[PDB]
């Protein structure tokens, strides 16, 4: 009855070997080469901040590394600390707890130490009533470079938020680094979805993956484990309805489970990923039906951003030092490389002109969706007026101060037209100054889009870009894209009562008690739908889509169709008003 | 002398077997199939959040499940934890309490654990002065997936509000799920009203139910127990007036109680349901007298919403997997089903035009009343200006952020005409953006109604719908509906002094001391009432209703009526000014 899963040695963060290699350079090295500790008498960097969003976990990775070092280091011992249980009313009780763990690691052979919950065991000094915080932070710092060196042991602070630490722990000398976990996206997603399927001795459908790792996103690894559990008991139900309606404890035939794709989709629908438990994510891929009316522009637009932002991937420095040249002993050769990607851009800013309901923010979530691993936020009023305890312009500086953090980062505003009427003049001037407060040498997108087409844009829009390459113009969808948009429906109508689960009354199930021990009628409508919409906005096709879907939801059990079109065309007629 | 009631094994949440089955899949399974714990070596989901409004209870359901597992599992033991008594000044006292319960469940056979009051025993870390919260939350999380697995025991957090937990408990790995209790409405209401009548060995009138479960709504189960108690002692009084005016302790004849419907109605009037102890509920069914003047439109309107919202009931996935097809091993068949109910709607929004006092908000509470189990709130100034510590637009984002929570949900505004003059331009722009901030693929009603008929609507109204199918037009009531409205009164006048309890002087009661051990005169008025109102608003008939009711309240003891009509017609005459 185990709870916890059994994928260890960096098998729970499966799909991400780059940070694995990055860490195996640092904790692994002091115990790899002790000879250079006086041949070159320095401190090889030890101490890792496990950090990242919950759902990835911060602790499963701990025993991940623990198995990545246990047999890798013959031999190394382990010291595990979880939860904020290093307190007391005595300044010396919390003192001696960490001191005891320290010396017992010192009274040990080559060893390592695990700080889960550094935020609780090492919170910020609130020096007004609680000054055991002073003692615990001072002694944890002295265990690194105070009265006690880092020795041949290593410290690993498990962290979930960056606001629960004073700026005395993630500095060099204690950990020297920061480790973030980026939510293995698709095929790293594939490895983390298949590792949990490594548990089924009977063969499970995972070859069909990555058709399951598509929609698995934002769950970390623990929630993917929730996914496999849910699909599991889904298959349980699909096997045995003797679970309910069965009173006495009983038995089975001793080999029972067979998983169905349906069970996977069951588990798929019932739960939600981690970024959105109560906050919607601003990045989401385009729906397939928007594709025949949106990819045409989206390709050009993403091309253009790749132009103004040639960053689209993550460059591994491991592979850089994997391929070196002998033509490097100087800086002017280095000055070549620094010149590029630094002098190659000017102030990435972008806006979109278009009509209301003209695909506005239909691409919005997806353009972030086409590339990740990038610094982001929104200047949207959801977070602008989110702040209550600080002024609105204080919010401005706080978000621009998030961007103060050097990163290829993103300003994100969709349909700014409502914006700049939300805020006072002073907020406008604030944002404008902060834009001027930035240098062209830095690489950060400024992203906006408007429900007002150009030539009528706000006076704050007509100057912030003032260039074709700082703006995208949008038009109406072409007829030929449209007919593809209404393409599938025109045949879904003529295969309904069998291709959809509404033409068939559902199949009854039976299970034993398991004895207990204890056409040409269509083309006119085809011409009808067209030429009644030429000039219609994007949303209006959505309206008609929904309506005709209602029609077919009704006709789901109809046979010999092409007699069911009248409601379609009449809905067309009524729609025009 | 027992307090607590005696309906157990999910007999206190009677009327709701769906969540019963849902939970019996999860806690019941790890102890049902321990063989798949290494044949497939996963953690069957254990840990339930009892959650829902008080009145349903959170704890009676606990022993409900306790009896649904005690004999169902031969054998299982139980560990019950109630109240926030797992604190101390020592970080280790609270530590060892939960640790002791954990191991004693570990030093036990197959067992379960009950967390009542998880909000108190597991509140949020306030990391400024109280950091035993860190210890208790960390150890409760480690009891699941820390130093101690969930084992063969299960955890049940009893919760009353969702704001008393940090986002580290309702995640997968501890409970993995959330359980809400929807207030068994009518016939689930019937089972919960009859289960308390299961206590009377003498036969009680409950066959007349569900004429008692009609008006029982919003009481959960405990308040229905209050209802049966109150009707009980009502029948007590109806039996014995020797309760008062009786000094010495005394005795009876040893079989005494006989319940009357009157006692039920006594209990009915004296108390209030749970949703409204100090907050009125916005959903209430139509009064019967509004029916002859409102059902005609209400039918069409609810039809229309069913069109724009085909959701009207709750689909059980248990029955889905109860009927599966062999024609499912792919996703395009799945893509069929996902296409429907996702692409079948466009942005459910609705408005009503009509006159002041034209039935405005007479249907308002009832249109929610005709269908439940749906996500709701109001944009009414009661909650708009309710907020004091956050800005008004902050309130906007907070409510739109409640809707951020994915649900088939409801925007509710009655008589918006006053609205949009309440708020600044910025609130308007906020709501409008947030409307644009939503995608058509999502299924959420936008609901409004106006005291201004169309063609004179606010400029914010004339565009937010701009379609016949986004709006309902209202007219005056037809004469024939009216005459039915004044139908019953025309005969109530002519059967007064016996059909009503005002023509008879009430009957005296006596009880022994119980010896102690220690016409044609009418039709003119019928034509009078009509043709003096043709064009009159809805409320005006209400006025006349009240007035004539005063008349008859006076004439309650009159005999040989049709001589009492003059006051009626003269009230008509005076009314016109």
Author numbering:
A (entry chain C), B (entry chain B): 256 to 773, 1128 to 1186
Structure paper excerpt:
ATAD2 (also termed ANCCA) is a histone chaperone that has been implicated in nucleosome density regulation by histone H3–H4 loading or removal. Although histone chaperones responsible for nucleosome assembly and disassembly usually do not contain ATPase domains, ATAD2 is unique because it is the only known AAA+ ATPase histone chaperone. Here, we demonstrate ATP-dependent histone H3–H4 deposition onto DNA by Abo1, the fission yeast ortholog of ATAD2, using an in vitro single-molecule imaging technique, the DNA curtain. We solve the cryo-EM structures of Abo1 in three different nucleotide states (apo, ADP, and ATP), revealing a major reorganization of the AAA+ domains from an open spiral to a closed ring—a structural change that can also be recapitulated in real time by high-speed atomic force microscopy (HS-AFM).
In addition, we determined two cryo-EM structures in apo-states. One structure was determined to 4.3 Å resolution, which is similar in resolution to ADP-Abo1. The other structure that showed clear features of the bromodomain was determined to 6.9 Å resolution from data collected using a Volta phase plate. Therefore, we used the 4.3 Å resolution structure of apo-Abo1 for comparing with ATP- or ADP- bound states, and referred to the lower resolution structure of apo-Abo1 for describing the bromodomain. Especially in the low resolution cryo-EM structure of the apo-state, six lobes of density that match the expected dimensions of a bromodomain were arranged in a hexameric ring around a central lobe of density. On the outer face of the bromodomain ring, characteristic helical densities that run diagonal to the central ring axis could be observed. In addition, we also observed an extra density at the center of the bromodomains, although it is unclear whether this is part of Abo1 or a bound substrate. In most asymmetric states, only one blade disappeared from the field of view, but there were also rare transient cases where two blades of the ring disappeared simultaneously. These HS-AFM results were highly consistent with our cryo-EM structures that show a closed symmetric ring for apo- and ADP states and an open spiral in the ATP-state. The “hole” is formed by the AAA1 HBD, AAA2 HBD, and a linker that proceeds the AAA2 HBD. This unique addition, which we name the “linker arm”, stabilizes the hexameric conformation and explains how Abo1, in contrast to other AAA+ ATPases, can exist as a stable hexamer even in the absence of nucleotide.
